[PDB]
Write a protein that binds this DNA or RNA. Structure first.
Ligand SMILES: C[S@@+](CC[C@H](N)C(=O)[O-])C[C@H]1O[C@@H](n2cnc3c(N)ncnc32)[C@H](O)[C@@H]1O
Ligand SMILES: [Zn+2]
Ligand SMILES: [Zn+2]
Ligand SMILES: [Zn+2]
Lengths: 104, 94, 78, 245, 92, 101, 78, 103, 89
DNA sequence: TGCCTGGAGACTAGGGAGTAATCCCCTTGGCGGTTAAAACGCGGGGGACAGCGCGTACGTGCGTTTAAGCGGTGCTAGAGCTGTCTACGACCAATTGAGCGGCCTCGGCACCGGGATTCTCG
DNA sequence: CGAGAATCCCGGTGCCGAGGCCGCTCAATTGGTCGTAGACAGCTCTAGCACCGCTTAAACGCACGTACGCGCTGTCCCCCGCGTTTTAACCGCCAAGGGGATTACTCCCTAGTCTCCAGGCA
């Protein structure tokens, strides 16, 4: 008895996404390829942000990923900064930036 | 031995753009929230609600002082003034 | 009068994180009023959600929903 | 000395003591006026922004629509729809508020005007009124009239195509002379959609002093003329060999 | 009470792209909030697209249109490519 | 004997008169056919052989004029805060930076 | 080059409606690029809605939906 | 008799109930919600039309135009806050000149 | 189908001897639709946070108090309360 | 005005919400001790602001040129509205394995202290 | 250029939170039936595109003058680095009890169905 995530080749679940689509007042009917497509998109976005977070963790000589590493990983990429331009991350800080006229 | 004015300021800019801790104390902020939440008398608060309010408040204030600094640099000055804050909150849409 | 508990070194440290090198002497009374207006708006929305939910305790999800209503979208508290 | 009387009298041409050889004129007249203008489509009304009181005059009383009005700064007189109504002071071309003038002889250059009493700066004196020409008639009447051997040419160009004649009919502003030290001048005021030419003062002119205005210099023929004032830097002649209009 | 999460799935994604890297609980909560927010955005845009054309079923075409409107640049191209690759393998 | 011109307006009076004249009226300030050609030219880059309505271009023109008027309304405040009257492109860039664009 | 069809007195007339007294010489070349970016974004979203709706004509409700997506609600063309 | 005659309103109630049951908002819809929402919409419509009628009488007109709607909305403290991100077609702007530009 | 005749019925009660153009009628149609969508969407959000399946007058009132300003929301709540009181009595 | 399509009037069943009880978790209040941080002067160098001089870029005005509107006609791609029907999603019965909760265990990382390097300024 | 305050590097200690493991529910899975939503086909007819002649209002280009943006200089106020004193924040511990949260029972409120008939849109 294989699942639908093993049949689609994904790591995110399909039945949970299908349950959240059917129990969220979005439409009357839900197609059979929509949670597979949406789980593929969410898995791609998760891997895309975790690659940059792991690169920041390797750059700062650490093993674990912290919200400062997530803040650097989001704000150092332009497309993620455009997608998440109205998001505040707790315990993430800011970017180092000093204007060229304030310093001699 | 004394430093020229501005070196300690740039040192503080570097160390507080490097650090990630909270800058406002917790009991004065909590007493401020519990004072101005008196809307509905005899309320009650969790710790994470005030912990979220403090994060949002400090993020809002840092995001306002960045545009205040941009207005002060555009006015060909270094000192920030309340008219820069008023210009930033006028252009921002508030 | 607990708005005077937001002291001058705290506003100065927030301005040092904001990148400000030199600070005048009139910024503080403006910053306290702006902080007071922002906190009054967010606490008004949170107390409205709490009064709708038939509860006496203001939780954190009410604050997250009150920030989502204004376009802030805080992560880390659920 | 002016003595405006409708009976024609025994003075030939100089008009210094008897003004009834020619005819006088009110607000000017047109010949080929058509309904193509900005009159009543976008300049329907240009109302000032004033919140007056108008119940306290002669005691703590500011005059209505002074030098803080939106219309006086932009050289526009108000309409009848003003919030001050019949107390607004912009409408000076319509209520005919003028200055005390007199025409006698001063110098052998010709006739002119001298101030009766004291008259402050930015004060209206007289309106330039005459007969409005058009495109074709100007270049025909100037060559029809140049062969009549006249000294004084009463031509003022309102715009690039409008030139007003004040020869057949003219008010008391036709006698005013030219000098290289001007104390009065000309301005372009817009009243009721139409453009009108006035005369304002610039300084504190004493009682019994000259009131002339500066010409924007122009020649039309081959000959040249010169001025007889000589204040401090009187050129007299024109600005060289120019030929513009 | 038993509550839904995404922590084991984020851990399975993290142990493929970085075989030696840990993650803290605060970062896992930020990732859960991110997944929930992007889910709500795509589902709301798809439910808005389903009502304009007077349809009743949300399918992968509406999901693809909601992704294409919402993601900027080459990220939308790669998301459409990954989703089409995952839907193509499911039918076979 | 020459025809003299009366005077010439000081710089600023005709400009403030045009400010009042175009703040009083409500009309389209841009020519319609160059705007339509511009919209069709930039819409050829996304799908070849399209077709447009008239209200679909009218709504674009209304939105574009409102956007540009709001941008100049913020940019004039930037130029006044810079203690000037002339409007610079650095004022436009400051307005688009503080606004979030 | 139909971006030159947006003439200089049209931009000057928009600045006179916006309350600008005196204009420099590069505002026109800045405004053309700003208008080009804004129109490219709105036309991209409108053509996306049109290609989703399986039509070939671009209606006005697609433009209204794209302007609502940008956050600029327009009353009148509904 | 209709429910708009029972409640004393002018906006309909059945159309609001149909749009609540049709637009996928929840599973069930109560009984006082379309009446309450129709009263709110009628109050807001009457306020907008009252201020538009005042702005239309202030300019010697007998027909309300989008410029009169623009002046009525932008000359009010709270309607400008409710409709701050809305562009009205053929509406224009408010006449104002900064005080550092006038001579 | 629209709200045009109802906008006429509201307009003839507050200003008797006046008219309205079709463009202003379309703007009022868009305004009514926008406020309907805002209040219905916020009342749909409020019913999900408490895990309820029914939108009620309390839900609509909570969506009114969150969305409208201070002096406007009080009169809106008062008018809606009077209208829902007259419906049962 | 035609009329027809959507709104009202009764009746019933089933599950959704309202009330009561009780557990126990988590919020509020209080007392002491340490010390880090806030408060208060104080001298001085740097920057904000005012005054002045100069050259140019942008305003207003006139004559010529150009293409935006304004109608009239014609052709056709494509929007829009019905008909068939077939394949796809809702719904239920039985079942099993994946994931949430609870419990140990050890190692990445935080604090502290010594030694050497790096920028600052008179 | 050399005192002198920050600052980086290296090691040692130890600790509490990330992670593996297990027991056990409840929700994903598979099979089968039925109804209906949309996919396809086809007909009508309607605005969208293309061209053409005329008029005239707006755009363009050149001339010229003067108000303003920019650079320089002087002054004096005021914010910053530093030192000393006072204060309350933070940690730690303790205890009372109020309300979130869950479960069980029961009433009543709205979806569904059928019939009837007038309100509003062309
Ligand atoms: C308006 S009149 C001025 C005086 C006029 N001669 C009079 O007595 O009424 C203009 C005519 O007078 C002539 N004029 C005015 N001032 C002059 C002067 N200073 N020198 C020579 N001719 C002058 C000009 O030739 C012009 O044609
Ligand atoms: Zn006035
Ligand atoms: Zn007046
Ligand atoms: Zn002379």
């Amino acid at each position: 008895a294989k699942t639908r995530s093993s049949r689609a080749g994904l790591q995110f679940p399909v039945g949970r996404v299908h349950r959240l689509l059917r129990k969220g007042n979005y439409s009357e009917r839900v197609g059979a390829g929509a949670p597979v497509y949406l789980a593929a998109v969410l898995e791609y976005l998760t891997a895309e942000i975790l690659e940059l977070a792991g690169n920041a963790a390797r750059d700062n000589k650490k093993t674990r990923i912290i919200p400062r590493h997530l803040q650097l990983a989001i704000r150092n990429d332009e497309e993620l900064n455009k997608l998440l331009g109205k998001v505040t991350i707790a315990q993430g800080g800011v970017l180092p930036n000093i204007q060229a006229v304030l310093l001699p | 031995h004394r430093y020229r004015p501005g070196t300690v300021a740039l040192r503080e800019i570097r160390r507080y753009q490097k650090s990630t801790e909270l800058l406002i104390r917790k009991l004065p902020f909590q007493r401020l929230v519990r004072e101005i939440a008196q809307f509905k008398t005899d309320l009650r608060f969790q710790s994470a609600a005030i912990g979220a309010l403090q994060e949002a408040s400090e993020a809002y204030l840092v995001g306002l002082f960045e545009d205040t600094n941009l207005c002060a640099i555009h006015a060909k000055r270094v000192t920030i003034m309340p008219k820069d804050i008023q210009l930033a909150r006028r252009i921002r849409g508030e | 009068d607990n708005i005077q508990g937001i002291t001058k070194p705290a506003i100065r440290r927030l301005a040092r994180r904001g990148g400000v090198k030199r600070i005048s002497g009139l910024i503080y009374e403006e910053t306290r009023g702006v902080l007071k207006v922002f906190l009054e708006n967010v606490i008004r929305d949170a107390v409205t959600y709490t009064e709708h939910a038939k509860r006496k305790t203001v939780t954190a999800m009410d604050v997250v929903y009150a920030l989502k209503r204004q376009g802030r979208t805080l992560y880390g508290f659920g | 000395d002016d003595f405006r009387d409708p009976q024609r009298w025994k003075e030939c041409a100089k008009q210094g003591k008897m003004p009834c050889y020619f005819d006088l004129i009110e607000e000017n007249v047109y010949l080929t006026e058509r309904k193509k203008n900005k009159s009543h489509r976008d300049i329907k009304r240009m109302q000032c922004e004033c919140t007056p009181l108008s119940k306290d005059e002669r005691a703590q009383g500011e005059i209505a629509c002074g030098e803080d009005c939106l219309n006086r700064l932009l050289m526009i007189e108000c309409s009848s729809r003003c919030p001050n109504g019949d107390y607004c002071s912009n409408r000076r071309f319509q209520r005919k508020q003028h200055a005390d003038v007199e025409v006698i002889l001063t110098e052998k250059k010709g006739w002119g005007l001298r101030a009766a009493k004291d008259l402050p700066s930015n004060t209206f004196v007289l309106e330039y009124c005459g007969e409005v020409l058009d495109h074709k008639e100007f270049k025909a009447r100037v060559k029809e009239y140049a062969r009549n051997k006249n000294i004084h040419y009463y031509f003022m160009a309102l715009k690039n195509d409008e030139i007003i004649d004040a020869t057949q009919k003219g008010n008391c502003s036709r006698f005013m002379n030219h000098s290289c030290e001007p104390n009065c001048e000309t301005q372009k005021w817009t009243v009721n959609g139409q453009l009108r030419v006035g005369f304002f003062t610039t300084k504190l002119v004493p009682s019994g002093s000259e009131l002339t205005f500066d010409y924007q210099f122009q020649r039309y023929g081959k000959e040249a003329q010169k001025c007889f004032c000589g204040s401090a830097n009187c050129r007299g002649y024109l600005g060289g060999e120019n030929r513009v209009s | 009470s038993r509550k839904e999460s995404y922590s084991i799935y984020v851990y399975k994604v993290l142990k493929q792209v970085h075989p030696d890297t840990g993650i803290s609980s605060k970062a896992m909560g930020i990732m859960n909030s991110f997944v929930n927010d992007i889910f709500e955005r795509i589902a709301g845009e798809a439910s808005r697209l389903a009502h304009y054309n007077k349809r009743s079923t949300i399918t992968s075409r509406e999901i693809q249109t909601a992704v294409r409107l919402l993601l900027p640049g080459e990220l939308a191209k790669h998301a459409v490519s990954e989703g089409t690759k995952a839907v193509t393998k499911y039918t076979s």
